[PDB]
Amino acid sequence: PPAVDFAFVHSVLLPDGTPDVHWRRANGGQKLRDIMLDSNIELYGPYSKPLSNCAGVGTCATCMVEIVNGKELLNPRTDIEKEKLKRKPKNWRLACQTNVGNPDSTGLVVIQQLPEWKAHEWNIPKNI
Amino acid sequence: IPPLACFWSKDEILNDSLLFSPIFAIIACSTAGLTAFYMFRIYLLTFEGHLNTYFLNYSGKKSGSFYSLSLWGKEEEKKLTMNNTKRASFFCNKTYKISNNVRNQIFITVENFGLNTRTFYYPHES
Amino acid sequence: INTEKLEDKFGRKGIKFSESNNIPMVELKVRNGSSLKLSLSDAHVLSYKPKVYWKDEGFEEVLYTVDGDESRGGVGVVIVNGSSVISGCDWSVKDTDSDAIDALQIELSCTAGVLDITYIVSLYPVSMATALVVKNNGRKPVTLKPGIMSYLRFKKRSGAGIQGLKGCSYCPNPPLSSPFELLSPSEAMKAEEGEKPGIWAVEDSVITLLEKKMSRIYGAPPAERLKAVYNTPPSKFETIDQGRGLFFRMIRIGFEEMYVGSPGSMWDKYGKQHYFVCTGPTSMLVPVDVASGETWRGAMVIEHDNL
Amino acid sequence: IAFFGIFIAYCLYKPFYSSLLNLTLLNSFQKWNSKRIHWEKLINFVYNWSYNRGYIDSFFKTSLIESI
Numbered sequence: 140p141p142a143v144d145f146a147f148v149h150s151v152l153l154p155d156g157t158p159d160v161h162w163r164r165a166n167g168g169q170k171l172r173d174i175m176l177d178s179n180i181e182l183y184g185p186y187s188k189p190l191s192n193c194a195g196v197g198t199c200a201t202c203m204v205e206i207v208n209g210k211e212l213l214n215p216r217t218d219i220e221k222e223k224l225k226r227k228p229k230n231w232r233l234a235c236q237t238n239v240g241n242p243d244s245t246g247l248v249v250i251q252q253l254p255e256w257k258a259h260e261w262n263i264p265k266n267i
Numbered sequence: 268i269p270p271l272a273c274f275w276s277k278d279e280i281l282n283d284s285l286l287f288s289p290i291f292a293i294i295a296c297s298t299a300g301l302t303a304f305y306m307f308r309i310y311l312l313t314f315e316g317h318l319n320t321y322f323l324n325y326s327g328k329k330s331g332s333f334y335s336l337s338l339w340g341k342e343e344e345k346k347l348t349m350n351n352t353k354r355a356s357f358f359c360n361k362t363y364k365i366s367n368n369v370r371n372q373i374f375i376t377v378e379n380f381g382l383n384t385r386t387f388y389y390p391h392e393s
Numbered sequence: 394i395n396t397e398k399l400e401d402k403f404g405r406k407g408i409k410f411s412e413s414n415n416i417p418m419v420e421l422k423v424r425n426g427s428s429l430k431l432s433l434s435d436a437h438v439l440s441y442k443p444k445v446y447w448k449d450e451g452f453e454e455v456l457y458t459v460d461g462d463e464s465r466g467g468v469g470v471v472i473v474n475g476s477s478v479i480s481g482c483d484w485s486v487k488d489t490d491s492d493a494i495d496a497l498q499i500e501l502s503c504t505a506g507v508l509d510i511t512y513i514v515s516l517y518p519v520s521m522a523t524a525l526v527v528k529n530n531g532r533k534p535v536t537l538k539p540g541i542m543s544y545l546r547f548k549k550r551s552g553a554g555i556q557g558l559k560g561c562s563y564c565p566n567p568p569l570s571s572p573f574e575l576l577s578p579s580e581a582m583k584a585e586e587g588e589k590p591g592i593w594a595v596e597d598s599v600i601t602l603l604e605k606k607m608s609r610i611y612g613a614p615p616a617e618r619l620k621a622v623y624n625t626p627p628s629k630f631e632t633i634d635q636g637r638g639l640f641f642r643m644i645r646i647g648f649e650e651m652y653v654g655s656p657g658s659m660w661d662k663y664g665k666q667h668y669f670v671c672t673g674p675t676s677m678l679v680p681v682d683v684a685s686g687e688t689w690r691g692a693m694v695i696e697h698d699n700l
Numbered sequence: 701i702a703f704f705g706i707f708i709a710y711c712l713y714k715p716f717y718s719s720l721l722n723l724t725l726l727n728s729f730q731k732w733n734s735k736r737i738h739w740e741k742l743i744n745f746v747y748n749w750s751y752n753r754g755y756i757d758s759f760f761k762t763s764l765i766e767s768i
């Protein structure tokens with residue numbers, strides 16, 4: 140079956156000093172917010188309270204996730220990721236405004252959830 | 268709340284409301300229930316629960332600050348900075364039919380340090 | 394007084410070595426008054442009182458133990474293959490100088506022949522740290538199963554939940570045979586609503602009730618054989634008390650699956666107060682096989698976020 | 701009706717380790733409502749209302765002050 144290989148690196152470190160990766164499974168692409176809600180990984184952080192989110196429409200920058208090596212199978216920004224978050228390191232997307240695409244999809248996108256409240260920089264490779 | 272708070276005002280409001288017009292009255296009581304709802308929501312989001320900002324699930328600088336030394340002491344490192352792309356978790360895990368496992372992507376999750384502005388003074392009384 | 398020898402050799406500012414009723418024992422005290430009663434030469438922790446409230450009595454007892462029986466109560470680490478490997482009480486300290494007053498560490502050391510089990514108990518201001526590391530020396534790959542079983546007492550019996558093992562599949566699996574048990578694996582799976590073999594069920598609740606006998610291991614190590622994403626279960630959960638308003642969190646490092654053990658109604662036959670839970674991560678449903686000479690690192694951290 | 705509002709806010713925001721309610725009922729609150737499909741429109745409409753100020757702020761900044 141077509142299984143996209145999310146990694147979902149958590150924001151905080153382990154107390155040992157290594158990151159903890161969870162490697163979620165869910166099929167295809169419908170919304171990244173629905174995948175992170177369904178497969179039980181921590182999207183919102185402190186905004187995970189019930190009325191602390193816009194329930195998927197994009198009117199709040201609360202589902203933001205740093206995505207690295209995520210130029211392969213992803214939709215472009217819907218002028219809401221371009222507007223809610225503006226002065227960012229440009230690898231940050233809204234899970235309720237991004238989508239990893241079609242159900243026939245294989246890929247190794249790795250997503251750092253909660254780019255707010257983190258301490259690592261990921262040392263991104265310079266494109267082009 | 269009648270004994271130790273203010274209730275008799277709203278009691279007189281709804282008492283003067285229900286003998287006036289039936290349209291305005293039950294929606295006023297419904298908004299009173301909503302008012303109790305959001306005010307208790309405000310009180311719970313402010314005072315009841317963990318802090319949501321110094322919470323060790325959330326803040327990475329907090330996890331870097333509490334753990335001044337690791338869990339092994341003098342093992343696994345002299346400390347490690349520049350933790351690399353440990354997708355395989357150093358388990359030498361081989362790949363089945365998939366898109367990619369390794370590539371020309373060499374990105375090390377270089378985390379921040381410890382033992383610097385370590386205190387993070389908790390919110391004391393004014 | 395062998396603990397006096399450890400005191401004038403390795404004793405430090407927050408480290409107090411104690412020897413009463415010819416039992417070596419150490420008490421770790423970091424700056425915020427956090428008490429940690431580690432029984433020496435046993436790799437077994439009795440008591441743990443970190444500052445939860447903001448009083449002078451902010452310290453609260455976390456681990457369950459009775460007053461007299463030090464072998465029956467508290468978190469003890471256990472290593473099997475399939476017999477008990479570390480039952481020899483030859484545990485000795487290796488180094489202590491870790492940090493001044495804020496964070497402490499007592500690392501013990503033994504030797505089971507091919508396995509050099511040195512064992513770290515650290516005291517941070519918010520967390521107990523329990524760290525196992527073995528090291529092969531002989532020419533034999535050992536197929537060992539580590540185990541760190543903790544016993545967290547709850548003030549009220551109605552207040553029991555783990556808050557966060559939803560979504561991942563669990564299997565009712567009887568625990569490891571520890572010398573520091575509270576319930577045997579024969580009675581841990583007796584008179585429940587999970588069946589005795591490794592039946593599989595998906596947890597569909599964000600918090601689980603620990604009222605019944607139903608005891609299980611969370612995670613899918615049969616999925617681990619595929620070495621795909623394989624749905625790695627979360628390394629954290631918020632165990633709660635609800636009798637008084639505090640909670641705790643357990644973080645594993647190096648382990649894969651996490652066991653909980655609910656005593657159900659059978660807590661009356663040993664103790665009478667402070668209903669507990671037999672919780673900890675193991676490498677049991679798929680064991681670990683290191684090498685003919687390498688080392689393996691597996692750590693467990695119980696933390697509080699109240700302070 | 702006020703204590704009903706207290707109770708609805710209490711089961712949603714007061715965490716499990718400090719709430720005074722029985723954990724069977726507290727478990728059944730999420731067990732009855734783990735779908736977030738008939739909640740995914742209600743929470744959306746209430747949050748968009750409180751965030752866009754009933755759209756009256758946007759309408760006044762669109763056809764009252766920008767009209768001027």
Ligand code: FES
Pocket residue numbers: 172192193194195196197198199200201202203233234235236
């Ligand atoms: S939930 Fe409102 S930003 Fe995605």
